[PDB]
Write a protein that binds this ligand. Sequence first.
Ligand SMILES: CCC1=C(C)/C(=C/C2=NC(=C\c3[nH]c(/C=C4\NC(=O)[C@H](C)[C@H]4CC)c(C)c3CCC(=O)O)/C(CCC(=O)O)=C2C)NC1=O
Ligand SMILES: CCC1=C(C)/C(=C/C2=NC(=C\c3[nH]c(/C=C4\NC(=O)[C@H](C)[C@H]4CC)c(C)c3CCC(=O)O)/C(CCC(=O)O)=C2C)NC1=O
Ligand SMILES: CCC1=C(C)/C(=C/C2=NC(=C\c3[nH]c(/C=C4\NC(=O)[C@H](C)[C@H]4CC)c(C)c3CCC(=O)O)/C(CCC(=O)O)=C2C)NC1=O
Ligand SMILES: CCC1=C(C)/C(=C/C2=NC(=C\c3[nH]c(/C=C4\NC(=O)[C@H](C)[C@H]4CC)c(C)c3CCC(=O)O)/C(CCC(=O)O)=C2C)NC1=O
Ligand SMILES: CCC1=C(C)/C(=C/C2=NC(=C\c3[nH]c(/C=C4\NC(=O)[C@H](C)[C@H]4CC)c(C)c3CCC(=O)O)/C(CCC(=O)O)=C2C)NC1=O
Ligand SMILES: CCC1=C(C)/C(=C/C2=NC(=C\c3[nH]c(/C=C4\NC(=O)[C@H](C)[C@H]4CC)c(C)c3CCC(=O)O)/C(CCC(=O)O)=C2C)NC1=O
Ligand SMILES: CCC1=C(C)/C(=C/C2=NC(=C\c3[nH]c(/C=C4\NC(=O)[C@H](C)[C@H]4CC)c(C)c3CCC(=O)O)/C(CCC(=O)O)=C2C)NC1=O
Ligand SMILES: CCC1=C(C)/C(=C/C2=NC(=C\c3[nH]c(/C=C4\NC(=O)[C@H](C)[C@H]4CC)c(C)c3CCC(=O)O)/C(CCC(=O)O)=C2C)NC1=O
Ligand SMILES: CCC1=C(C)/C(=C/C2=NC(=C\c3[nH]c(/C=C4\NC(=O)[C@H](C)[C@H]4CC)c(C)c3CCC(=O)O)/C(CCC(=O)O)=C2C)NC1=O
Ligand SMILES: CCC1=C(C)/C(=C/C2=NC(=C\c3[nH]c(/C=C4\NC(=O)[C@H](C)[C@H]4CC)c(C)c3CCC(=O)O)/C(CCC(=O)O)=C2C)NC1=O
Lengths: 159, 159, 159, 159, 159, 159, 160, 160, 160, 147
Amino acid sequence: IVTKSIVNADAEARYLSPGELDRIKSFVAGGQQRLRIAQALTDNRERLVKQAGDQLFQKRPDVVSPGGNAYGQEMTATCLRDLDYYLRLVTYGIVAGDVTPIEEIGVIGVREMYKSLGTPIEAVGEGVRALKNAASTLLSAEDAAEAGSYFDYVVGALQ
Amino acid sequence: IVTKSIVNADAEARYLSPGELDRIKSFVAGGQQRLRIAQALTDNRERLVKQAGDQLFQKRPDVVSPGGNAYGQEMTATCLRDLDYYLRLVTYGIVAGDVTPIEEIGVIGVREMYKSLGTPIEAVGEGVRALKNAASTLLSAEDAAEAGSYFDYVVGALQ
Amino acid sequence: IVTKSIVNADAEARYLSPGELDRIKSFVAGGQQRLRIAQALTDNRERLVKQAGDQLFQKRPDVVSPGGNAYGQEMTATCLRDLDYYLRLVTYGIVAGDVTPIEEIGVIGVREMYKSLGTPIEAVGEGVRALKNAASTLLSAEDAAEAGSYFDYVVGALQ
Amino acid sequence: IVTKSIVNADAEARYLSPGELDRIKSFVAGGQQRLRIAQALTDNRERLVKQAGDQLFQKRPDVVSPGGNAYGQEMTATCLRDLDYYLRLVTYGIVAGDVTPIEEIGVIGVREMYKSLGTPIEAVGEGVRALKNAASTLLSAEDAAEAGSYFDYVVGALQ
Amino acid sequence: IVTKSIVNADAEARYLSPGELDRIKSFVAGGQQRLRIAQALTDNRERLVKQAGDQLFQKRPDVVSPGGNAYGQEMTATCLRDLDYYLRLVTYGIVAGDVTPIEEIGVIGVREMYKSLGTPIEAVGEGVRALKNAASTLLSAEDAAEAGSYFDYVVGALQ
Amino acid sequence: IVTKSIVNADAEARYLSPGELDRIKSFVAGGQQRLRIAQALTDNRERLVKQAGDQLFQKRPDVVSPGGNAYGQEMTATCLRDLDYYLRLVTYGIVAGDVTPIEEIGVIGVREMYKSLGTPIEAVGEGVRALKNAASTLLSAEDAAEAGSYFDYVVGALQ
Amino acid sequence: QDAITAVINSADVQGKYLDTAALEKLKAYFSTGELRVRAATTISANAAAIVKEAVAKSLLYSDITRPGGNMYTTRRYAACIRDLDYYLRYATYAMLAGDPSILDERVLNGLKETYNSLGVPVGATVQAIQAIKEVTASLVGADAGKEMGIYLDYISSGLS
Amino acid sequence: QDAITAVINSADVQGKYLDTAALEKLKAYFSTGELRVRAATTISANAAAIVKEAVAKSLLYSDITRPGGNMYTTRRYAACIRDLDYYLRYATYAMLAGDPSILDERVLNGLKETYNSLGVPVGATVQAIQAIKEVTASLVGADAGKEMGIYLDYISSGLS
Amino acid sequence: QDAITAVINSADVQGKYLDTAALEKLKAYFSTGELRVRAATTISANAAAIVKEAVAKSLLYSDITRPGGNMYTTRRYAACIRDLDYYLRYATYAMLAGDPSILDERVLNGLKETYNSLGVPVGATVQAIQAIKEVTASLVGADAGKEMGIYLDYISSGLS
Amino acid sequence: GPGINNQVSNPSARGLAPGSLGPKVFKLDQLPGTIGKKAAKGASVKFSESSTQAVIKATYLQVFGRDVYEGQRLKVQEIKLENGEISVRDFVRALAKSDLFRKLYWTPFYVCKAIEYIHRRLLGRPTYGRQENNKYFDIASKKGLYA
Ligand SMILES: CCC1=C(C)/C(=C/C2=NC(=C\c3[nH]c(/C=C4\NC(=O)[C@H](C)[C@H]4CC)c(C)c3CCC(=O)O)/C(CCC(=O)O)=C2C)NC1=O
Ligand SMILES: CCC1=C(C)/C(=C/C2=NC(=C\c3[nH]c(/C=C4\NC(=O)[C@H](C)[C@H]4CC)c(C)c3CCC(=O)O)/C(CCC(=O)O)=C2C)NC1=O
Ligand SMILES: CCC1=C(C)/C(=C/C2=NC(=C\c3[nH]c(/C=C4\NC(=O)[C@H](C)[C@H]4CC)c(C)c3CCC(=O)O)/C(CCC(=O)O)=C2C)NC1=O
Ligand SMILES: CCC1=C(C)/C(=C/C2=NC(=C\c3[nH]c(/C=C4\NC(=O)[C@H](C)[C@H]4CC)c(C)c3CCC(=O)O)/C(CCC(=O)O)=C2C)NC1=O
Ligand SMILES: CCC1=C(C)/C(=C/C2=NC(=C\c3[nH]c(/C=C4\NC(=O)[C@H](C)[C@H]4CC)c(C)c3CCC(=O)O)/C(CCC(=O)O)=C2C)NC1=O
Ligand SMILES: CCC1=C(C)/C(=C/C2=NC(=C\c3[nH]c(/C=C4\NC(=O)[C@H](C)[C@H]4CC)c(C)c3CCC(=O)O)/C(CCC(=O)O)=C2C)NC1=O
Ligand SMILES: CCC1=C(C)/C(=C/C2=NC(=C\c3[nH]c(/C=C4\NC(=O)[C@H](C)[C@H]4CC)c(C)c3CCC(=O)O)/C(CCC(=O)O)=C2C)NC1=O
Ligand SMILES: CCC1=C(C)/C(=C/C2=NC(=C\c3[nH]c(/C=C4\NC(=O)[C@H](C)[C@H]4CC)c(C)c3CCC(=O)O)/C(CCC(=O)O)=C2C)NC1=O
Ligand SMILES: CCC1=C(C)/C(=C/C2=NC(=C\c3[nH]c(/C=C4\NC(=O)[C@H](C)[C@H]4CC)c(C)c3CCC(=O)O)/C(CCC(=O)O)=C2C)NC1=O
Ligand SMILES: CCC1=C(C)/C(=C/C2=NC(=C\c3[nH]c(/C=C4\NC(=O)[C@H](C)[C@H]4CC)c(C)c3CCC(=O)O)/C(CCC(=O)O)=C2C)NC1=O
């Protein structure tokens, strides 16, 4: 969020306006809660990928069906690896406080990648929704709100 | 500060990124302290213009001198009215949280106005510095810092 | 209500409607109670007029001020006679059910008249409001709603 | 009937005259009987269309005859659907208290419609007369009078 | 008079005095006439209250003035209800012979009450005086002395 | 007076008839006397408002009385400000030579304004009459005639 | 003008209020107003049949409906129907008001000059109005029939 | 349109008969019509006093009635009183109809076009309608003042 | 403009300092900003689903998507989706600003000119914005759906 | 009004009713001052006049659009129409030749804009094309607004 304000005041010839300094000071204050939320999502990763695969393959069985992409153990392992990647990028966005280092690695060219891989993007969005539900069950209320923030950004991005 | 983020995300085709939503939520939280600082500068306007004229005419006596612009009671009344205007715009910038509604009314064309009025701009900058010193004496430490923020913007703008 | 229904069915080419005949039947059924209200207002003419006029002079002392219109015994006697006239027209309207007797005897050209007499309209209206309050206190409750609503027509039509 | 008085007093610059307020209060009083009559005609619709088709095809057999319009099951079903439409509009006019929302949907352009459909309008008038007779048998005396009111309007309108 | 005699002999250590037993005997002997006076005042509730209130508004037009408290139909209805309450307490005191029912139902804290209601005390008192005059005109002569002296207690205790 | 003749000949398709050119030439000749009369009424304004308030509050004391509108220093200051406005419009009509630019600003909707302000219009007419008397004392005979012209128009207009 | 507004106007020209003589007139008007309402319903029932029976009794098969008469043409026959329909409707209004002045002011203002200028015969209209009077007196009743006939004869006397 | 006419229209465009929810809506309207009529009567009593109190609350002694303001000229003051009387009268009509469609059809149709053409200040008009709403909610009571304030706030929201 | 910037402007053009009514307005805005931000987040979640549901509610299976209609050509269907996404996005901006001035400045400026130039049907657009408003008021809740529907109805009213 | 009697459609249905979709019309009936034949003329109520004053209200309402202020009612033509000589179309003609109508709808506007707006007021419909337009504008060029 510091790079955001820096390039924001850098396109202008002005310095960083002190309201931006206030938002940087407030983010610096909230960084400890951000780090605890990121560590709580860090250590419990395989539970979240398990419950996300659970809720997704209960929701959409066509990836399980042989016409779909995630058919067989190798393809379903690649599917849960993709969900692991997106959980990792969500933890990066939780620490960074703003969605730039997660959009730069997971969002900015995802539609043409998944189009030329054959997979549907709506099933990936449902998988990140299942990750958001499982992390909402894992965390407290003020933690699940702040995690569902960035999970919500990914779900809106994949659609 | 909401118009800043809105036109900032509006030049792009993207929505408001949730880091900007975090800065809006933090400004919404700090708005009560902003309102108290603005009311404290509001009710004590007479004192601040008096001490600013005090410190300015002690600092630069050429406006008092008949070759300068602020010679006589009418011209010195117009001078203190200008300082009153700048204190009013500083209170607007304190409430708005970002320097746009004060630069739009007091900064953006001030150099050619004061050039075609004959007055020097450095004396106006010293007057806003005197206003900043008097408001620093009037407020507490965390209030004087946040007032000297926008006063500092005006002093940098008039130079 | 018979004259108004007849002229309204006269403007059209058709007869009197079943709805309008129900209106005439209900008006006949309530006519005896309206004659009772007219009996009470006829027999309370003196004290109602005097209490309403004195309530007017309590509210508005400008008329009985020596710059005012109702200055002197004869002028104030004509003031009370005007209030008597309006109470008489209110009784006519309570009996008829129309406001056409109130209108074409005392409403239709009263503004130009009291403009040429020098008399303020609003004080007439306040006196008729005092008549409304007095006759509301004298009568039975929803009977007073009936009387005061014709009084309300006179008050709203005078202003 | 409220829209009638409102546009009636709206063409004039005057307010709603209180005789119109009396007719609105009386319609408001009779609305419960109107609602009971409309529900009684509502729940017994298929009986009324059956007896109307009975009395019409006994009265005029040319719609049954192959030169007429209502020949065959499809055309006779469209015929009874038209009678159903007119019964529905009669219930609307019974609730509304005045024939505007039924003339706006069933009367105002019916002659050219039935002329460019080939059907005679007198047979439709006889069908609404049969509906009036069947509803007169279905209701009590004061209900059949008030239903035969709007049925009578439709019969006069189709001629 | 039995309660007051009992508590007065309770404050002392002794029984009821022969004088006090003569008082109770005379009160029993006059009790039937007091029930007759209560019968007349019960049956004349309406017109006594209305005549007394209208005599009050003849004397004091400040309450029904628009700056006054009893401005409007509802406020003046509560005014007449207050006069009804006080006439009811006067009948209770005429029956009991004590003024302890009048006192502990309607006298003891009425000044602070009507101070907090914004209502003037003296106009209440003038209305109860009008009740005294009206009930004095209705009853028999020394019977009216009896009724008006309890009314006199209420009038003197309100002020 | 030139706009009067121009729209007068403009409703017709004809040019300005040369009798209208004669009246414009005569007004052009008298314009110097008009300008001197307007300057004489201009520089002596506060005397005229003082003597007008003098003669009005001597004539009608109800505006002074608390039931009237001009009660208190603020309301009497608004009253003398209204008289100042009317003197200003009279000077405009003296220069323009015809009563159009004074009726357009002070006459054309004054009755409903003063009716919905509560003030009587006859007292305003007496105030303009007092202004006419004071300006008649201030000017010479041929000047007071030509000023009492437009003052007379205002006095006739307010009635 | 009603009978009520006529009573009020008479008392207003006197300048007094409504005491017992005017009140007794109003009680009389209320007592007849019940049967007046019933007669208005039974007249509005079959106004078309009343006009049809009246023209069939009086105007048909005569010289005026023959070629060379005032009622020969189809627009003239329709004007005749609408004029008799009017006379019935305004006699109903004047019956319910209990007062013939509204009827006079409505139609007898200019119908004399109109029937003069158009060449409409007066006596055939008087016969048609009398036939309306007989048909409504047979249809409604005795006393409401003569109440209707008072205003119908008022129309017929105003045209003559 | 009415609330009755809106219910009939919503039942009509489906071809639906009057089901029980529409009968509930009509019976709720027939319940509320009592205070609707009483509120309309007492608002028709003293509309001029309401407009006078509203301009004395909001618009008077500002810069708007000073020279340079939009209410300086006396024809512009009369036009201001006319516009406020229009807002109050059409809000009375929409209150008695129980449906704000007449506000959309007769007032709010081309009004922002006119007020931006003439240079009429919109925010001062909104505050004047707000002062109208406070005065009539005080005058009529809270229970009918809610329904009056709904249509006055409808005018204020459509104006902005 | 903002609600903050509008309050500051209204205090500025008088030369007035920030009085207590303006501080009330700013504190009400600072109270409502919570649900404003949460509503803007969940509307930014699934804008495509809202537009899809709105065209499935209002515009689909009509004559508009049939040949002869204005949404028949596939570039015109894509332009329809673009216009509805614009309405939803600018309504989100006006909801978070709390002031409809950006709708007047960026959307409603020359839009009727364009829609009457291209022959775009206006009533179908109004019904589509209505379906957008119903879908997002269901999706976000009633309490923020009121403020969303205010600016969507502002777009609908200015369009008509 | 009803659709079916569009003037482009039924040139034989121009004097019809406006229906219940259109606005409500005003016919001057029951002219006040004709009170029977028999000598009287001492009444008070006279219910016809209260309905004739409303026609005079609606004439201002449709030609001027609003009600006129109190000081600018045309009282001479008002009492002349109530007397019985000048008729409603004569009153509309004498109203549209007043100074207030000129200074409100002819003086501040363009000539063609004022002609079109006077067609919106008096005839109640917009002008069809140019066939009416430098026709009424050719008439305006010789005698003026009054023509
Ligand atoms: C961190 C940024 C990042 C992303 C986003 C990413 C995606 C990604 N997904 C892939 C495959 C895949 N992705 C999926 C996806 C899914 N299973 C489904 O049914 C759903 C639609 C979805 C997940 C629930 C599947 C089934 C394959 C194997 C497809 C194939 O083998 O052709 C592959 C190719 C195989 C590989 O090298 O892993 C890439 C590169 N890689 C990255 O480095
Ligand atoms: C709110 C935005 C705003 C600004 C900034 C502003 C400036 C402003 N300063 C002015 C005059 C003046 N301004 C000054 C200024 C000063 N005295 C000095 O010696 C110092 C250099 C300085 C202040 C301490 C003087 C002396 C005059 C009178 C000059 C003259 O009369 O020519 C004038 C012309 C007179 C007037 O109309 O007030 C304007 C418009 N007006 C505005 O509305
Ligand atoms: C039935 C309908 C009717 C009315 C209303 C009416 C009023 C009326 N009021 C008059 C005078 C007056 N009227 C008032 C009235 C008032 N004093 C005030 O300040 C109050 C606002 C108002 C009391 C309501 C006064 C003071 C006079 C005497 C004025 C004078 O003599 O010049 C006169 C002239 C003298 C007379 O003949 O009595 C008439 C005709 N006449 C009628 O026939
Ligand atoms: C609610 C307002 C409303 C009306 C009035 C209405 C009339 C209506 N009648 C129709 C047909 C018809 N209407 C009739 C009518 C009749 N059978 C007879 O012999 C009699 C003359 C009469 C009824 C007893 C017949 C026979 C047809 C079929 C004619 C055909 O198919 O050409 C049709 C065309 C087919 C359809 O779409 O239903 C319409 C639109 N529709 C409406 O929405
Ligand atoms: C049995 C003993 C007893 C008394 C006396 C009593 C009085 C009483 N008077 C009230 C109001 C009132 N009382 C008055 C009285 C008056 N108007 C005047 O100016 C006159 C001086 C006075 C008439 C005597 C008025 C005007 C109100 C309404 C004030 C309001 O609503 O705020 C109320 C509040 C509303 C209510 O509950 O009715 C009470 C409780 N209650 C009791 O239980
Ligand atoms: C140039 C055209 C013009 C006119 C005519 C005008 C009238 C005018 N008179 C007003 C008040 C007033 N006008 C008066 C008038 C009077 N005192 C009396 O007793 C007499 C009846 C009369 C004068 C001698 C009073 C007393 C007020 C204050 C009333 C109030 O505060 O409600 C007000 C409201 C307060 C204000 O903004 O000044 C206006 C707008 N304003 C204008 O711009
Ligand atoms: C029924 C709905 C309706 C409305 C509202 C309406 C308004 C309307 N207001 C107008 C003028 C005006 N309107 C205003 C009103 C205001 N200006 C202010 O400063 C205040 C904020 C506000 C008053 C509260 C003023 C001052 C004018 C005068 C402009 C002028 O005529 O020079 C005009 C120009 C012509 C004329 O008044 O006669 C129209 C048409 N017409 C309608 O049909
Ligand atoms: C931010 C505010 C804003 C809007 C709304 C806007 C609209 C806009 N819509 C357009 C076309 C269009 N707009 C529509 C929309 C519709 N037609 C219908 O039938 C429906 C009722 C409605 C969709 C809900 C269609 C179908 C076209 C295609 C016309 C064409 O390009 O051939 C065009 C022509 C060029 C182009 O799309 O690229 C513009 C500029 N521009 C703007 O800047
Ligand atoms: C000479 C060229 C010309 C045309 C075409 C014309 C059309 C026209 N059609 C109208 C209404 C209408 N037009 C239609 C027509 C249709 N709706 C449909 O669903 C069908 C697709 C289509 C029939 C094939 C309908 C249903 C209305 C009724 C809208 C209403 O009045 O409520 C109206 C509104 C007023 C009125 O009818 O009387 C006009 C002016 N005017 C003209 O001067
Ligand atoms: C008071 C200001 C005013 C003007 C100017 C005005 C002009 C005007 N000129 C018109 C036509 C015309 N105007 C011209 C004029 C010219 N063409 C040329 O070649 C020349 C350069 C120029 C003459 C110097 C012509 C030739 C027409 C005829 C077009 C036609 O009617 O077919 C028309 C169309 C209808 C009609 O004449 O009756 C208008 C309204 N209206 C106004 O209210």
